[PDB]
Amino acid sequence: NLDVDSPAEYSGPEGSYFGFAVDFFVPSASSRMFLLVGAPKANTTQPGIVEGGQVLKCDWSSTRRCQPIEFDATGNRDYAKDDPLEFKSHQWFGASVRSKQDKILACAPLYHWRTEMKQEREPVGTCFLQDGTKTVEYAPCRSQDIDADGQGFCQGGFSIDFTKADRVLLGGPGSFYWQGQLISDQVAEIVSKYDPNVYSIKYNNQLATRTAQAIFDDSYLGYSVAVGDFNGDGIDDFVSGVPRAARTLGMVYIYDGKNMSSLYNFTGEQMAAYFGFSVAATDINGDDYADVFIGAPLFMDRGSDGKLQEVGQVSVSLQRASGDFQTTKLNGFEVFARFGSAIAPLGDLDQDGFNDIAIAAPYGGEDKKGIVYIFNGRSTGLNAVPSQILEGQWAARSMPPSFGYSMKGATDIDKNGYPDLIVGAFGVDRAILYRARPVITVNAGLEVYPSILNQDNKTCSLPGTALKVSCFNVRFCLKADGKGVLPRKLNFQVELLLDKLKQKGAIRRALFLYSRSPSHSKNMTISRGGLMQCEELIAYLRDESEFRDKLTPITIFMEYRLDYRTAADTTGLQPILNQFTPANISRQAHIL
């Protein structure tokens, strides 16, 4: 409920699929932070390579200029005289980008190479790992098990992720007749064993899934990957989606992160729903136990009438100490919007104490320009009602904008204490960064010194005349606080009016003493975290000759408004009030 809507837009070359993959880059060597954007179809300067793709590093501050990062600058290598060893053209480099500290990992799933045994073109896939001043290639699937039945069509690098223990997880959905495969190698081994003159390198501590029976063919294991601990040992385990498994019902596998042993399986409910297109592992309810999110973009729901309609679905599974999972499901809101295409943990977006998650519907919204839904976690699980909707702004040139097809969060780029979000719109070659606004929590106090107004009491004196009139005191207080970077003091405009319920233009019973008015306005300045600041005003009731109604009780109503313009930081980011806290407070008092 706190993402801003005056964001920063980054544009790439036309037709480059700029924004297909997005991630943050947070080097430990400097305070600077950058965005990483993949452009799998971007033309490059590599000799003789057409649409090889590239990854661009875009800074947030300054002019917001995107510049490529040079992972590779050479054409196809030659196995022998004029017979290429590689085919980098249309390799889709940058289709997946992931970074951790100063390490950047980018992969080219459609990279074909000519095996050493035969003249071939096998999409083994390749990845490049940059860890500072040094760059190394990483192609685990470019082994000597060269065939469709082996891992020649592995397409390694289709999806990737980093574990806490500096270990990479890589998925190739094409290995072993498209059964799929998961490969995990330590970053230390990848760098230390790199050799440009060796094309099939063997890593000692590699963990890889083995081939299975022919029944499992065309399962696409490794279509998506995620990491999280699911057996309580401190080591991140591997979560992978298998959208075509179980007669296309879809499936998700969890493998032990220490020896690649199987732990759990999730199965879909509807055929062809692509259950497992996207997966995410994040703790959504304040436990040490991570929770599994699974997307089914094509799930068909049954409306009020019995007719099915394609809306998409996301499955939320809360991990329990006993190893069981408690599962609930979110259905999409629009037909053919493909809700659940991308899932991105946001961290604690509003610092509520529970992590939050974003789910994308890249083809929903008006004009089908894309929608992103923000959900807030709760101690009981995920809150099923989205707290915010982000809408794509750019119209299609020749392809759906796909705003929300790729997302990434959980990183605070401007160091305001709240994590931000990057959304990709590769359909129009744009990526947009949304910054989280600081959240202010306000507590309002309001009371009247006498609970019941007796009219025979005439203690107060009418100012400016000798009349004595029955009176009472109304005291209102305002206290505000909030985490993160906020100004020390905030300006609130407090509006007071009484007899609110009967304000149909008729007579008013109560009135303020000094102002001779039924309403009052005060600009109040309050400091964060301080004690309840209070002010008091004296109000009185009119004489019996003015009104007849002794039945309806007198009501006091209070409304306060934050001055966002002044509270904005130097960069123009305005705070926001907490969603649940009411914007008004009122109290009743009887007349006797």
Partner: protein, 481 residues
């Protein structure tokens, strides 16, 4: 009396009628002050009120086109009628309801269109050989059922891109069967071959010159061909007045949406026609496979009955897929397609052995309930379908339309149509939530005091600030005691 209409002080006719369907309004000024203007219809006549003054609109259903059901399908195309009545008009009040009946008959001897869509992977060479003369045999058998048969042909293998396509040596692009020392055509996505024609001999002529191809992975790109054979009306040649059968024969699993990402295809299927003058599906290498929802939508729009004629190893898979696609059936195809003719004939029997109704453009303020008088004079409540029928059977449905509020737009017509048939019933719903007397009310009427209120349908309606039955005063300044 303590009627519902008297439970609250309705302002005028505009609110009196909206209380409940049996509420009535009296506009005469002679109406005594002790009698409420809003009450049950009969009560206003017990009191002094002119019958012509009482508005009390009522709901009705009027039939506009009520042509009789036809007997046999042969003859004038414009005359064959399978659904009656064809058009009706509904006038109804807020939260009101009305009931009307629709009769559906599956006329015999109806023209039939069969589009034979064939998988041409390498494992279907024998299947292609076996059907080389299916046109004449199919014409002979269908003669018993329809007298205006038309047939066509089409083929598919898969998207011609890696990793599905062989590209390893240069020659494999022109002859993907080189490594087994034989010749076959280069891979193709979808290929329209023969437009629906009644020259059945041309089916034999055209199918004898087809050749199989070879792809790498097991799943096929059939759904692309199913989508294209549906939305390309002009080339396929579907007749607007005919039964549309789309026969889909395969012996392997099928690719589904979001599979194209492995090949670098991320653009969703748009559902448009992309078959060019060369009869090849041009967007095969650019657009992803369609989803079941889009396929179902396009099939419903074009009134296509899709038949899965698949081998034993995938019969269960395609049965499960058909469960999600209304109007489809599955048949067991032999390993050489020797029984395809009987499979088609049986499938046509099952398709016209069931009647199912669908509704389009239904306003959100309306809801429908169906009672089906399937077969003999017995009704199955709450069902919009009837099964176990045979060609020539007549079935009747009873439908109730229910309102929710009163929409601003007073005409929101919608359609009720059997599945797979062009004939439909169009409902011209007209929301009658209004009072005619309102248009002739006197504004700022001196009928009320000082022109303080409009004289709405025989009663004062005060302007701002003013109150009272005669709009006498601007303030109260009134005590019941």
């Amino acid at each position: 009396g303590p009627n519902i209409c008297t439970t609250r002080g309705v302002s005028s006719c505009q609110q009196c009628l909206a209380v409940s369907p049996m509420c009535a309004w009296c506009s005469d000024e002679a109406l005594p002050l002790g009698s409420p203007r809003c009450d049950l219809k009969e009560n206003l006549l017990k009191d002094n009120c002119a019958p012509e003054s009482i508005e009390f609109p009522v709901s009705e259903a009027r039939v506009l086109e009520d042509r009789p059901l036809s007997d046999k399908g042969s003859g004038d195309s414009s005359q064959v009628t399978q659904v009656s009545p064809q058009r009706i008009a509904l006038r109804l009040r807020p939260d009101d309801s009305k009931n009307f009946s629709i009769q559906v008959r599956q006329v015999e001897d109806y023209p039939v269109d069969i589009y034979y869509l064939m998988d041409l992977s390498y494992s279907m060479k024998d299947d292609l050989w076996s059907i080389q003369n299916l046109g004449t045999k199919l014409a002979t058998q269908m003669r018993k059922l329809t007298s205006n048969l038309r047939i066509g042909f089409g083929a598919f293998v898969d998207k011609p891109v890696s990793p599905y396509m062989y590209i390893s040596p240069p020659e494999a692009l022109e002859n993907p069967c080189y490594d087994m020392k034989t010749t076959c055509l280069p891979m193709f996505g979808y290929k329209h071959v023969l437009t629906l024609t009644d020259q059945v001999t041309r089916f034999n002529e055209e199918v004898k010159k087809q050749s199989v191809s070879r792809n790498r992975d097991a799943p096929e790109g059939g759904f692309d061909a199913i989508m294209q054979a549906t939305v390309c009306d002009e080339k396929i040649g579907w007749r607007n007045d005919a039964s549309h059968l789309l026969v889909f024969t395969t012996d392997a699993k099928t690719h589904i949406a979001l599979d194209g990402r492995l090949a670098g295809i991320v653009q969703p299927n748009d559902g448009q026609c992309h078959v060019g003058s060369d009869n090849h599906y041009s967007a095969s290498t650019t657009m992803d496979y369609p989803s079941l929802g889009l396929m179902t939508e396009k099939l419903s729009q074009k009134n296509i009955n899709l038949i899965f004629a698949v081998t034993e190893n995938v019969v269960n898979l395609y049965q499960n897929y058909s469960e999600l696609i209304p109007g489809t059936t599955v048949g067991v195809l032999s390993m050489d397609s020797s029984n395809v003719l009987q499979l088609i004939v049986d499938a046509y029997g099952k398709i016209r052995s069931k009647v199912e109704l669908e509704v389009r453009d239904l306003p959100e303020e309306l809801s429908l309930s169906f009672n089906a008088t399937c077969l003999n004079n017995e009704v199955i409540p709450g069902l919009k379908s009837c099964m176990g029928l045979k060609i020539g059977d007549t079935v009747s449905f009873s439908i109730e339309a229910k309102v929710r509020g009163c929409p601003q737009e007073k005409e929101k017509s919608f359609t009720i149509k059997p599945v797979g048939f062009k004939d439909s019933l169009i409902v011209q719903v007209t929301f009658d939530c209004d009072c005619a007397c309102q248009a002739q009310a006197e504004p700022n009427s001196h009928r009320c005091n000082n022109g303080n209120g409009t004289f709405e349908c025989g009663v004062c309606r005060c302007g701002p600030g003013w109150l009272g039955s005669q709009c006498e005063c601007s303030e109260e300044d009134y005590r019941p005691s």
